[PDB]
Amino acid sequence: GKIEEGKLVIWINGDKGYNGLAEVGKKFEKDTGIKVTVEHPDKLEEKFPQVAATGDGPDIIFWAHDRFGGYAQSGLLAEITPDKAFQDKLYPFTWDAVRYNGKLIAYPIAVEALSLIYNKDLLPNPPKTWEEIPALDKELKAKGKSALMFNLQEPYFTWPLIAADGGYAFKYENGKYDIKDVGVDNAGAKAGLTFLVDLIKNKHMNADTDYSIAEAAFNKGETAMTINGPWAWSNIDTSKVNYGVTVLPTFKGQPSKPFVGVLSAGINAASPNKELAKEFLENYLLTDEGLEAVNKDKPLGAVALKSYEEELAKDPRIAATMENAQKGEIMPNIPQMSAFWYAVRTAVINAASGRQTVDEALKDAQTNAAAHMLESKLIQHIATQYLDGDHDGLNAQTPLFELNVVDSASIFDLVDFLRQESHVAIGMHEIHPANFASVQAMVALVQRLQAQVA
Ligand SMILES: [Mg+2]
């Protein structure tokens, strides 16, 4: 076939320990005689679907799990077959991240999540609850320093508190994310966003803190704690700060829920070398020896193999990562997450500013999530149906009456698509060029009509 039999080719990104991985390949070669090539090509996460669709590419590819949903949707990744006793060797929740439509489609390797990062000097015993930070802020403000500063512009950093009492992005019970059940306006999320908003109202945080500003104030020793991930550690190090990394505070007695990214190894569905790859992944890479080789090349962080995690979890920073990850929520591997992110970004910006109540901000977030998803559905519809499949520059703001889309009769087809997908009636008097000026305009129409009916 297009892939060479009796060999392993592996793609992993350049920032990873590939020299370590190669050394594992050389151990595998020593025992089986099978050679193992480890490559780090540019944009390999875009090449891979393109070469795998044709029946080519690496035997094994490494990437964070969320990308593997689209590869699975396209059928590009073999269903892996670990036995129950091998699965038992990894933290159970890492297996949730490599499931797709009820099949296992990759092996979990390593795991990444936010933690609380604190100044041992200014705060030698960090707080365990959100509820005690307003106090610790006063008694700390009274000496020219603040308690907590972290990036409030990006929902990645604020969602752990918001989800703590019950918010969620997309519900999945069947190993299947339900993209119409979006858990952004429920009792939990309101409790937690209210608390984030009451911190800003009460002078404990500032609504315009972003990533660079929080990272600067903490490395300058001007604040006791920030929220960040293992990527920020080396900057703290260079800093001379006396820093620790621990459990995220609880809210309403419940753990904060950061999103978890899970670095995974999947097997090319087009590879003839499936059992060679499983043998290499279970019996050579996913062992204390395999993982240490890679980890001593470039650190992996908190790893999914229980035995080797207990070793590296001696580093209490790394113990923090895994702990917050276990208490968190797996990043959904579907495309509609970009709709969640957009909806949550706006909702939190507007609530923090006082522009919107927490209530109206989160009900909008439900509305904007649905709007953003129709937009994607409508762009793809137009691309497939009137543009011979060319997603070229066609975005929500593109003038349709310019493009060769709205025919004499095709307008009726667009209207009825809007009807089929939103279950709202569209009268003749709404079929005019301001409503059909762009995809954005078409979606605004649908949501104005739904708002009118309710
Ligand atoms: Mg076994």
UniProtKB/Swiss-Prot annotation:
Keyword entries, A-Z: Periplasm, Signal, Sugar transport, Transport
Cellular localization per UniProt: Periplasm
Cellular compartments per GO CC: ATP-binding cassette (ABC) transporter complex; ATP-binding cassette (ABC) transporter complex, substrate-binding subunit-containing; maltose transport complex; membrane; outer membrane-bounded periplasmic space; periplasmic space
Gene3D superfamilies (UniProt xref): Periplasmic binding protein-like II
Segments passing through the bilayer: none
One record GO biological process: DNA damage response
Pfam families the UniProt entry points to: SBP_bac_1
Entry superkingdom: Bacteria
Induction comment from the UniProt entry of this chain: Induced by maltose and the transcriptional regulator MalT. Permanently repressed by cold shock in a PNPase-dependent fashion.
PANTHER family per record: MALTOSE-BINDING PERIPLASMIC PROTEIN (PTHR30061), MALTOSE_MALTODEXTRIN-BINDING PERIPLASMIC PROTEIN (PTHR30061:SF50)
Subunit structure: The complex is composed of two ATP-binding proteins (MalK), two transmembrane proteins (MalG and MalF) and a solute-binding protein (MalE).
This protein's name: Maltose/maltodextrin-binding periplasmic protein
Gene that encodes it: malE
